[PDB]
Amino acid sequence: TFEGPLDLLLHLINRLEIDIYDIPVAKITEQYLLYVHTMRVLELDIASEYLVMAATLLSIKSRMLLP
Amino acid sequence: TFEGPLDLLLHLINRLEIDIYDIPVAKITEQYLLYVHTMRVLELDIASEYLVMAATLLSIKSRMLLP
Amino acid sequence: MFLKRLDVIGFKSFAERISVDFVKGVTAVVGPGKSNITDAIRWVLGEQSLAEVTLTLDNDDHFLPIDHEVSVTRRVYRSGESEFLINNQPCRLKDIIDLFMDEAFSIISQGKVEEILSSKAEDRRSIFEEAAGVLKYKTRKKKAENKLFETQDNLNRVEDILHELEGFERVNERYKFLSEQKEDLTEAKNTLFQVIEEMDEEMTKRFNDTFVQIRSHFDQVFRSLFGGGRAELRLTDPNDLLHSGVEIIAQPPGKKLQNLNLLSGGERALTAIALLFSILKVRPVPFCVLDEVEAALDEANVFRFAQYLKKYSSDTQFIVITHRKGTMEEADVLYGVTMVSKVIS
Amino acid sequence: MFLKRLDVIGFKSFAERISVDFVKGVTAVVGPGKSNITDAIRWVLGEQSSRKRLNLAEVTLTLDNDDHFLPIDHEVSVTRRVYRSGESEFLINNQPCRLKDIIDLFMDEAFSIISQGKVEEILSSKAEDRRSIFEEAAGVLKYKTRKKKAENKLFETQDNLNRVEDILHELEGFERVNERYKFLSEQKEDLTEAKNTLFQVIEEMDEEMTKRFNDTFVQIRSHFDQVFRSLFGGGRAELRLTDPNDLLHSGVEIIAQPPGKKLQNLNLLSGGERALTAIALLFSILKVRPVPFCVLDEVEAALDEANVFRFAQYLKKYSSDTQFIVITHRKGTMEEADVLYGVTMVSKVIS
């Protein structure tokens, strides 16, 4: 038992999606689409959280320069 | 210009932290500690988000089994 | 989750306790003063909205089971104070959300259905931005920018010393480094806007990926109700998406593809009901109430609409209030409400 | 961000408009009926806290309207009304709005509002529930929510297995059966593998959650002792842990020895010592998860002078951090203040 809590639930979550939707064919279904949206919007939001924190340190580091 | 929006702001964010706090010595400061907390709590929360979604697909896949 | 019950005392038209027991899925309300039950929940939830002695309090209770049975109850007086109680212990309002965000319910009246159709097609996209889940990005992106101008102004303030420094051991070692470091800083800055681009690409990619889905169901649901015609949602300024607008065009059977309103009728009604079933497909919610919405529809219309909810059951909990026949017998459980007001089956 | 102003009409003791202009950082309020200004913001904000005027040398009133000038990164007006019957309205920049709409830039915690009772709210509470305050500063509550639902979600996937184990024994015995059973137990075996490792994940995450908890808990300990001295000058101050392990549901004791009396239990300390310790505690929790709004409602009234000084000192120094609006009759703060508004009972106010 090793690596992370996260990537291991990535090995996982990925393995599930395929086992439900991406099973032979990969059939697009109303609640498949839903599934991707909920997931694909998240990543944008997480990214936007690291986006705010990134700009933040910049203003901070921008600021240490000068008195 | 390539790879991701994310990892590229990881190359970045990492490069900033070091340039502010981890500059010679690496001096632990009140607002350094703050910085790590805000960051280190996030990852837990993000992980906990993929945690809920992981368990979800499981109940779903658990469910396709049976009628 | 699925609402158990509503306790009602002293609210608007409500004299006695009249408690309402609220099945899972479909539920119903009849009257010519009945209208006020939505308002109750609407109010308890916190969204906007002669023969007996006047009253100084109003108390409404939400039985509402979650994954336990969780009571949400709200009071007001003259002077007057207002209290908040989860499972009958007094609480704060931020405290109301919680399991709400860890949107939620939709509350639909005849006016809201005009709220939409009327609104200048600019602001309307907000409804799609919301379903495209793209609003959160837009917030943080916005603050990262306001944060970015900060780091910017500090550069300008830095550019200033750099020219003053055009000329002991102090100067050269600093200037060598100062412009060394600032050069590194504008590199960071640059690529952040880079990032906003890509994220704006995904934001829009996110937007119309969803916008396309809402289009499909809009036309597909339109027919299931009108039987049929074409329905599309246009885009004013196809590009400039983030601030672009959304037109709504519908041709009910008969009259050709043309503009809403000058359609008139309860056609212009139906199209929106059609629209709403479809937005509900992309970001669904397990609470839906409908306040006398089908009153412009003719029968088989009223049927097909009522049909849609008949079929929309296992999805979300539906409480619709109307005097209409199509729904009433196609309903599950009815409570009569008659003006002071009273109710039961 | 930093509050610009408060408009006040018809609220509790407030007859006329009395508008309050609210500097950035430190600000002040004097009186023997002044107490009601915190309540205003407290109420306009929506946190818990007659409610409209009625004063008998003047005609009773059926509305109450309070306005928050409050500039954000624009100048954003937050304003709240109530009547008999009565309706209540909500207006951002004087256009009517919903309440979920209130949060927004609030979460995309926030402010702290501190009265004498809240300072008892803490000290009294059975040391079990107290940890909530540290869980909150350790930012560990969100995990706890989602973890909780993932578990409730996990029992689901569980029960379906049991329901699956049932057919599997019924299937102990055409072409249908063998192909299915071979696969059924093939798949269920894979499923309990998924399930198992999820709890695995909750462990690690619970390790981080607690790692998260006391990493923060340790910081709040340092400042608690360091701030205690800066006020008492000095003694020792520690926060214990009942059940050191079992952390997630463990408790937190608060022990303090002010100068003189030895290290011993709060309350039986008595005084405005038992007061001060909490003010000390609070400056320190404020260090780990700070907020740019702090109000203090007549909090220093048990402190003696140099105490009142050092406390008031602390805010004198706590300026560039957050905006401070403290309300008191106390002298230490009043001259160490920045800007005072007098409030005198109907009530009236200005400098």
UniProtKB/Swiss-Prot annotation, chains A, B:
Cellular location of this protein?
Cytoplasm
Reported function:
Participates in chromosomal partition during cell division. May act via the formation of a condensin-like complex containing Smc and ScpB that pull DNA away from mid-cell into both cell halves.
Family, according to the entry, reads as follows:
Belongs to the ScpA family.
**How does this chain assemble?**
Component of a cohesin-like complex composed of ScpA, ScpB and the Smc homodimer, in which ScpA and ScpB bind to the head domain of Smc. The presence of the three proteins is required for the association of the complex with DNA.
Protein name in UniProt = Segregation and condensation protein A
Taxonomic lineage = Bacteria, Bacillati, Bacillota, Bacilli, Bacillales
- Show which stretch of the intact protein is covered: 10 to 76 of 251
Curated annotation (Swiss-Prot), chain C:
Sites binding ATP sit at P32, G33, K34, S35, N36
Keywords of the record, alphabetical order, are: ATP-binding, Coiled coil, Cytoplasm, DNA-binding, Nucleotide-binding
Using the record for this protein, list the coiled-coil segments as residue ranges, or answer none.
Answer: 134-167, 168-203
Record-annotated membrane-spanning stretches: none
CDD domains named among the record's database cross-references: ABC_SMC_barmotin
According to its UniProt entry, one GO biological process term is: chromosome condensation
Q: Which Pfam families match?
A: SMC_hinge (PF06470), SMC_N (PF02463)
Report the GO terms under cellular component: chromosome; cytoplasm
MF (Gene Ontology): ATP binding; ATP hydrolysis activity; DNA binding; identical protein binding
Family matches, as Gene3D superfamilies: 1.10.287.1490, 1.20.1060.20, 3.30.70.1620, P-loop containing nucleotide triphosphate hydrolases (3.40.50.300)
Its subcellular locations are: Cytoplasm
Q: When the coding gene is removed by deletion, what phenotypic consequences does the entry describe?
A: Mutants produce anucleate cells and show defects in nucleoid structure and in chromosome partitioning.
Which family does the similarity line name?
Answer: Belongs to the SMC family.
Name the HAMAP family for this protein: Smc_prok (MF_01894)
Role played: Required for chromosome condensation and partitioning.
Per the record, the domain comment is:
Contains large globular domains required for ATP hydrolysis at each terminus and a third globular domain forming a flexible SMC hinge near the middle of the molecule. These domains are separated by coiled-coil structures.
Instruction: Fill in the subunit field for this protein.
Output: Homodimer.
Spell out the protein name for this chain: Chromosome partition protein Smc
Swiss-Prot record, chain D:
- Tell me, according to the record, the phenotype of the null mutant: Mutants produce anucleate cells and show defects in nucleoid structure and in chromosome partitioning.
Positions annotated to bind ATP:
P32, G33, K34, S35, N36
**Record Gene3D superfamilies:** 1.10.287.1490, 1.20.1060.20, 3.30.70.1620, P-loop containing nucleotide triphosphate hydrolases (3.40.50.300)
Subcellular localization is given as:
Cytoplasm
Disulfide bonds listed in the record: none
Any coiled-coil regions, as ranges: 140-173, 174-209
Question: What protein family is recorded?
Answer: Belongs to the SMC family.
Q: How does it assemble?
A: Homodimer.
Quote the entry's note on domains. Answer: Contains large globular domains required for ATP hydrolysis at each terminus and a third globular domain forming a flexible SMC hinge near the middle of the molecule. These domains are separated by coiled-coil structures.
Biological function: Required for chromosome condensation and partitioning.
Q: What is this protein called?
A: Chromosome partition protein Smc
Q: Which organism is it from?
A: Bacillus subtilis (strain 168)
- Lineage from the top down? Bacteria, Bacillati, Bacillota, Bacilli, Bacillales
Gene for this chain: smc
